[PDB]
């Protein structure tokens, strides 16, 4: 076995490299330190950190959002610090419970929720241009930023675009561990079972394929570490036996293959498609489909099954039944 794929046997230390960016080279802060155990499964060097305007903008807005959430959570346990730790996962900040439509809700019923939402959104925008601008300062493509943009767009969809399109803030995702989880069933129940939403299926298909691809890709590169396949940039510009063998492994297995560069396009596209497909689904939900199961029945897609115990007429539609 090649033990180098499991962990680094002999770590190396050496002077810290700094690649100069078109700007902000002075805004890198902290002194690098090295971790020996980290260095067995990774790169040992932790830090420094770039610290631009946007990074701080993000921390500013995010902490505002986190504080708005935490104080509302604490208010839910009338500020008892011990019950706060005990009940933390059950505590949340909820959108309006009553129907105000698009009206700005009272603070005690989703106003605070709305404001945490604004400040998180601003934090995501700030972090986004950090992710983008860092790439141009170092003279790199904006690939990551576009993938990240899709992720942010999906959050906006479940957070406020979908509430806007149906016209009720009551449909936002709550903040909280279990509470954000509870929303998923409430939403799915309201809209007729998300298993019958094709864009759910697409999202899952790509999400699972990200599992398939990264397991497959990660395993492939490790299988060709002896020939240097981890040095992927120079294997793009000067094909070595590593990617030759990697390509022939797959070609002989599934009948076709990629290049060392294009597999990364595959992976980038699949991860992007998780969020693009999820977004289309939410945009269509509520606005143009009310019950995803009935929509599948309408179009002849739903499976059907014989009764096991006897079919049961809705009692509410028998004559003279109470309401």
């Amino acid at each position: 076995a090649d033990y180098q794929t499991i962990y680094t046997q002999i770590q190396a230390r050496g002077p810290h490299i700094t690649v100069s960016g078109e700007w902000g080279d002075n805004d890198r802060v902290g002194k690098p330190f090295y971790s020996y155990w980290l260095g067995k499964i990774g790169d040992a060097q932790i830090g420094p950190i770039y610290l631009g305007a946007s990074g701080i903008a993000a921390f500013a807005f995010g902490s505002t959002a986190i504080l708005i959430i935490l104080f509302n959570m604490a208010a839910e346990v009338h500020f008892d610090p011990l019950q706060f730790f005990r009940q933390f996962f059950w505590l949340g900040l909820y959108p309006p419970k009553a129907q105000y439509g698009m009206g700005i809700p009272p603070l005690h019923d989703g106003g605070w929720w709305l404001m945490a939402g604004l400040f998180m959104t601003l934090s995501l925008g700030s972090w986004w241009i950090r992710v983008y601008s860092r790439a141009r300062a170092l003279g790199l493509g904006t690939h990551i930023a576009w993938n990240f943009a899709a992720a942010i767009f999906f959050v906006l969809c479940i957070g406020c675009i979908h509430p806007t399109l149906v016209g009720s803030w009551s449909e936002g995702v709550p903040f909280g561990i279990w509470p954000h989880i509870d929303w998923l069933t409430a939403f799915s129940i309201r809209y007729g079972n998300f298993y019958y939403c094709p864009w759910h299926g697409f999202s899952i298909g790509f999400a699972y394929g990200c599992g398939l691809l990264f397991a497959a890709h990660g395993a492939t590169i490790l299988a060709v570490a002896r020939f240097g396949g981890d040095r992927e940039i120079e294997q793009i510009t000067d094909r070595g036996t590593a990617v030759e063998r990697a390509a022939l492994f797959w070609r002989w297995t599934i009948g076709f293959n990629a290049t060392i560069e294009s597999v990364h396009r595959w992976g980038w596209f699949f991860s992007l498609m998780v969020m693009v497909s999820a977004s289309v689904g939410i945009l269509l939900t509520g606005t143009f489909v009310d019950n995803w199961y009935l929509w599948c029945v309408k179009h002849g897609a739903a499976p059907d099954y014989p009764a096991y115990l006897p079919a049961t007429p809705d009692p509410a539609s028998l004559p003279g039944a109470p309401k």
Binding site: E76, Y94, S168, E171, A186, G286, V289, L294, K298
Partner: protein, 332 residues
């Protein structure tokens, strides 16, 4: 942390749909033993003499009965409701017609109520029926009742910790969670759905596309309604010791026909019956009860699914006394 195998499983849907009951034998055995304490029926007595309407002085509900029949009823009522307290819980030792003690008048309406259950709600209690024991389980205060706010513990025979006490506000989220099978759902399904008939529990549309006129802005029910009925269903599932699959094929929660089981229909009638009982029998009893029985808003204790079922899909595993006590219903 965990429960040791094996698990008893049942089937409630077509093969392949993973619908049925998943029960822990230990737990079922414990609940079976607890429910087996149901006292056996008293021996039958033969009807002799006049109706008790002409012998005793203050009998308005049970006047049809003869003396031996009637007294059999009274010792059964004592066995089911106040075994440890005895006849004197409802009566003055030296005036059995005195209504001076509040349990007397409540017991009178409880008689009318449980007779009503066994006559008007056969769509839910069927041939099994209910007796006083079904709810009371041998104490004057039934172990499982509800106020207009959630209380802990669910069994009022256990003593509350400081946080569990309703006046401790830091423990609200936990009081509420334990009513909804430990979920963080932020709704009290009892006051929303079981205390009265003001709210509809159905939330999911019966058309594929959104109907113009009910689908935008303030025309829309808020999403909270969906959370709320999820909560009610969690709470129902817990109260019967079962899961959604007992009643639903999750493929379409909103559909009946092949997508529902007969138990879902019975559960539907149970909602209606619990609403009748609360609105028309149990809630008005705040006039007749002492303040120590009322909740923090002057409400009497009311019933939910648990009051009868106590974690079993049939109360007391289907035990019945119906034919043994005709006086309790159904009445022609």
């Amino acid at each position: 942390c965990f429960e040791p195998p094996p698990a008893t499983t049942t089937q409630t849907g077509f093969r392949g749909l993973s619908m049925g009951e998943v029960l822990h034998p230990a737990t079922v055995k414990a609940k079976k033993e607890r429910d087996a304490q149901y006292p056996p029926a008293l021996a039958a007595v033969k009807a002799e003499g006049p109706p008790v309407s002409q012998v005793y002085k203050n009998v308005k509900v049970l006047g049809n009965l003869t003396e031996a029949e009637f007294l059999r009823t009274m010792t059964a009522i004592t066995e089911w409701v106040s075994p440890q307290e005895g006849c004197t819980y409802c009566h003055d030792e030296n005036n059995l017609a005195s209504e001076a003690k509040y349990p007397y008048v409540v017991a009178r309406r409880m008689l009318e109520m449980t007779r009503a259950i066994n006559t008007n709600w056969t769509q839910h209690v069927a041939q099994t029926g209910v007796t006083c024991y079904t709810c009371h389980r041998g104490t004057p205060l039934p172990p499982y009742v509800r106020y207009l706010e959630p209380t802990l513990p669910l069994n009022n025979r256990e003593t509350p910790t400081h946080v569990e006490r309703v006046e401790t506000r830091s423990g609200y989220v936990v009081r509420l969670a334990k009513y909804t099978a430990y979920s963080a759902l932020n709704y009290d399904p009892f006051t929303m759905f079981l205390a009265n008939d003001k709210r509809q529990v159905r939330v999911v549309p019966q058309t594929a596309l959104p109907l113009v006129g009910v689908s935008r802005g303030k025309e829309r029910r808020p999403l909270s309604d969906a959370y709320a009925t999820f909560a009610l269903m969690m709470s129902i599932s817990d109260s019967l010791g079962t899961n959604c699959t007992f009643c639903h094929n999750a493929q379409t929660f909103e559909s009946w026909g092949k997508k529902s089981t007969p138990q879902r229909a019975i559960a539907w009638w149970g909602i209606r019956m619990v609403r009748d009982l609360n609105m028309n029998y149990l809630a008005p009893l705040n006039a007749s009860l002492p303040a120590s029985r009322l909740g923090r808003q002057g409400e009497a204790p009311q019933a939910d699914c648990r009051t009868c079922h106590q974690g079993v899909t049939k109360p007391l595993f289907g035990a019945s006394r119906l034919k043994d006590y005709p006086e309790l219903g159904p009445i022609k």
